[PDB]
Amino acid sequence: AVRPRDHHDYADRIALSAATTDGVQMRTEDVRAWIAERRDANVFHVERIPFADLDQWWFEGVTGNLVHRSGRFFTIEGLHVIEHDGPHGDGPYREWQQPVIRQPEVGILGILAKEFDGVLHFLMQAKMEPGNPNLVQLSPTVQATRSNYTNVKLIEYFAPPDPERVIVDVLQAEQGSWFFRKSNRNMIVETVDDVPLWDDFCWLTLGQIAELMHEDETINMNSRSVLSCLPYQDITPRALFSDVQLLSWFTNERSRHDVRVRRIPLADVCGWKQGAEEIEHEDGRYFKVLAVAVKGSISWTQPLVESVDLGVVAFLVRKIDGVPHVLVQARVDGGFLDTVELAPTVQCTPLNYAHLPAEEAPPFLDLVQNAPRSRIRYEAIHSEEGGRFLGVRARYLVIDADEAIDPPPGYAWVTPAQLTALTRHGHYVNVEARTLLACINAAAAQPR
Amino acid sequence: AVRPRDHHDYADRIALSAATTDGVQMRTEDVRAWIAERRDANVFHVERIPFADLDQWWFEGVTGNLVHRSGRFFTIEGLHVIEHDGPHGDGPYREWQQPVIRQPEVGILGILAKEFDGVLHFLMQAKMEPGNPNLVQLSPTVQATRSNYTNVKLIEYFAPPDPERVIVDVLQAEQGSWFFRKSNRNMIVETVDDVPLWDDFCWLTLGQIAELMHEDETINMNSRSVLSCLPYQDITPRALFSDVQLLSWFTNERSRHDVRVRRIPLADVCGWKQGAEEIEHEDGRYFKVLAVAVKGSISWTQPLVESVDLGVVAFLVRKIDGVPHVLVQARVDGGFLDTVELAPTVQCTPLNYAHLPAEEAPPFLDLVQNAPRSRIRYEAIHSEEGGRFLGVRARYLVIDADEAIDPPPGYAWVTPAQLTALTRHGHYVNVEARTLLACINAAAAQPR
Ligand SMILES: Cc1cn([C@H]2C[C@H](O)[C@@H](COP(=O)(O)OP(=O)(O)O[C@H]3O[C@@H](C)[C@H](O)[C@@H](O)[C@H]3O)O2)c(=O)[nH]c1=O
Ligand SMILES: Cc1cn([C@H]2C[C@H](O)[C@@H](COP(=O)(O)OP(=O)(O)O[C@H]3O[C@@H](C)[C@H](O)[C@@H](O)[C@H]3O)O2)c(=O)[nH]c1=O
Ligand SMILES: Cc1cn([C@H]2C[C@H](O)[C@@H](COP(=O)(O)OP(=O)(O)O[C@H]3O[C@H](C)[C@H](O)[C@H](O)[C@H]3O)O2)c(=O)[nH]c1=O
Ligand SMILES: Cc1cn([C@H]2C[C@H](O)[C@@H](COP(=O)(O)OP(=O)(O)O[C@H]3O[C@H](C)[C@H](O)[C@H](O)[C@H]3O)O2)c(=O)[nH]c1=O
């Protein structure tokens, strides 16, 4: 039995859910209380601890890599990157070494969807992670690397998914500054079954999620990544680049740099000092590796990575003949698999550039940091994955560009719909850009 | 000025060219003579030579890697692969070390197109390569890694291409058994300019190329790779998997293996012996590294890689509700960037399996090797890139599967149109499958 190649398009159902803020389970204004109710339901204290007091983690002796004795979860290893300016690369030349998080197994980031009263809802999970600054945020229905579990609720809907019910299934990369070539499987799958409901789960329409997306530190990094992959229909199907032209532009960005990376032992990393409490850069930039104990009120100890300052991640937006475009950058990070990924107009931790002249600041940073309320279309503070990162936060913005811009090398005007289409594939849209696409789609569905 | 996202579709022009065998420059039956005329035009002798007699190549002392003293062209290094069966990978367990070709710079494989008498033609190049078994085959208009040239004819049409004239621009990977993560930029670009014509170039319609594609050792590996990317319109837009279902199936294949690879010094490779003339495997499988001198009648010396036997590469085909599907395999090779790529139903050098029991032969090999003329839809012998490979040939087949098959794990029925659509992106379709897609598209346009 063959079917049409575009069989079972969910675009109309997705649209109806995004337009609806009346959900079956909970009023949107009550979710904040529900989260607090879940946070209070078992108190966790996360305390920073010397590395020596890590329980089942150690620095293994030959490599000095920070590893869990069972061989599960992740490792902290070393990375050496060179970008050449020579031939076969445009440069400029860059070279550095750093600690890096490694985790070779693809994990599942799965959102279960089901219709109630004729409107799709999505089963969000109130999930405690040790590095969440507010402890509990809303994660996907299933957020798990399977072999980290000797028992994950609802995992069977994603392992394998029913192929008749897949809305989204794609691998997408995570932060290329701090993880070495990490991607997880982003999935949205429908069911008609009665689904068991545990206290930590709430069915929400996409319109309820769109409102919640404007709130700080509420919808977690993994939820924003998976929701960014939703295949909306394009309402304005024109763009400055045709889709082939955009693929060609990006092909040239991925071909024009000469980046060589190698994984090295953590003990070999130059420029970083390993103390009794932290591994930190010698000039206090970038991030630190630290250790925490997690106690309930169940317990464990683990490394986490913390950044040195609040980050700034922004898209500049311009309407071109009436069609909104965002200015992407084809960014070259050390942990990327295929040299480049598209990223927001500005993506940086500003302190990392404070030592350099104003003209080596990230392009457009000044413009974003000093923008008027009137040009700010979206602003919120979101944090990164709390299983690996301790309180790593950034101001995520969408700002109208007050005047035309000639994009500098490495930048291009692309529509959000073109970004939505590329999320069918991996290594095109980076995690920060995926978060801002989820924010743009939320602002469109439920504006404030 | 925005344009429609699907602006400037070339599908009707491509179709008209594929239907036309009356070309402006040459009758198709005369091309064989023209090639011989170009071969005779300057005779080259390629002779095998001991490694010692390599001129500007050496085994560098710390690594033992085979390198050109100028730092251009490619290197032969070592590779160590493990596939784990543990947990986080399906297995089975595999582990081996081998020499491998490395060349980090993306090269250009560019075909220039232009209308004559209202029909697109493509400017093919009669190109001598030292490893071509018959010396001269038809390559793309531009076939060059730019920094290997201190001066490449027509390169300016591809560097950068005119964005208003791009038909195809995409990176595609080469053999994952013998190259380490190598992709080149496959491009087809139109011009309305009068183009200079040198004696080694001939304008051909796509229908002329389709006829030439049925000939042995005529249209070279790089030309078949780039022509496989042509975006034909789908005449039958149904398939067993919807396009999302196919992406989901492939996502699970790319997530379910645990492959770890590292580049090592050639001197460290176990299981291979380096002699005065060849590096070869201790049990005489796989390939050898050898050295050749190339003399005109201009000269140089270089390594080449030769395989141990004629290869067999085949698609099995079945009509499913009237729609032809081919049985792809999601193949796991050591040089791939992203774990898997789709490959033909059968892709092997049979001698590499002669030591193992009949039940560890590649699935379907027996069926392909013993197929009836009546079930053979396409058969030809094609060789691989003659700049790196000495006489590496395989029988490329498309065969009707005499009965339904339940695909084994790692295999799936996909339509050729779905493969054509995935060639807009890299790392989905491997080079052997791209060659068979070009052959399927040739058999459809100009059947024999
Ligand atoms: C980590 C590191 C970086 N570098 C170089 C690499 C880069 O060229 C430059 C900036 O480093 P990056 O890690 O790319 O930081 P950045 O400030 O440019 O970007 C950051 O943006 C925040 C919004 C994100 O949350 C972070 O994950 C990161 O992407 O410094 C070093 O020289 N040494 C180092 O140890
Ligand atoms: C090279 C090598 C391979 N192996 C293992 C890896 C694979 O599991 C198995 C088969 O090796 P492969 O190189 O994949 O050979 P193969 O015979 O399976 O496939 C070949 O098909 C021909 C049509 C292509 O032209 C070749 O480039 C290659 O892909 O042997 C070793 O154990 N040692 C080695 O040195
Ligand atoms: C790190 C650690 C944990 N635990 C426990 C605590 C957790 O409850 C459980 C699993 O923990 P983790 O969430 O770290 O493992 P996963 O649920 O697999 O989540 C990871 O993978 C996902 C797919 C997402 O990417 C997620 O963001 C990522 O963190 O194991 C330890 O006992 N000791 C330890 O050292
Ligand atoms: C290898 C060698 C060559 N030459 C000369 C001979 C050639 O005429 C010229 C360039 O040669 P090559 O074709 O090897 O280099 P490219 O034209 O860059 O072709 C390579 O890259 C392409 C994009 C295609 O992938 C092609 O298949 C691939 O081979 O340089 C040497 O003088 N000494 C030597 O060691």
Curated annotation (Swiss-Prot), chains A, B:
**Top-rank lineage group of the source organism:** Bacteria
Give the range the annotation lists for the signal sequence: none
Could you tell me the EC number(s) of this protein?
Answer: 4.2.1.159
Q: Which reaction does it catalyse?
A: dTDP-4-dehydro-6-deoxy-alpha-D-glucose = dTDP-3,4-didehydro-2,6-dideoxy-alpha-D-glucose + H2O
Question: What keywords are assigned to this protein?
Answer: Antibiotic biosynthesis, Disulfide bond, Lyase
What does the annotation give as the result of altering D333A?
Same dehydratase activity compared to the wild type
Keyword Kinase listed? no
Mutation: E385 to A/Q; reported impact is: Loss of dehydratase activity
Residues that bind dTDP-4-dehydro-6-deoxy-alpha-D-glucose 2, according to the entry?
S177, W272, R331, Q347, C348, T349, N352, Y353
One Pfam family named in its UniProt record: Hexose_dehydrat
Q: What pathway does this protein act in?
A: Antibiotic biosynthesis
Record-level GO BP terms: antibiotic biosynthetic process
Asked whether the keyword Disulfide bond is assigned, the reply is yes
In which residues is dTDP-4-dehydro-6-deoxy-alpha-D-glucose 1 bound?
W57, T145, R146, S147, N148, Y149, N222, E385, G386, G387, R388
Family note = Belongs to the hexose 2,3-dehydratase family.
Subunit structure, briefly? Homodimer.
Q: What else is known?
A: The mutant Ala-361 is used to improve the quality of the crystals.
| Function field | Involved in the biosynthesis of the 2,3,6-trideoxysugar L-epivancosamine, the terminal sugar added to the aglycone scaffold of chloroeremomycin, a member of the glycopeptide antibiotics vancomycin family.
**What's the protein called, per UniProt?**
dTDP-4-dehydro-6-deoxy-alpha-D-glucopyranose 2,3-dehydratase
Organism this protein belongs to = Amycolatopsis orientalis
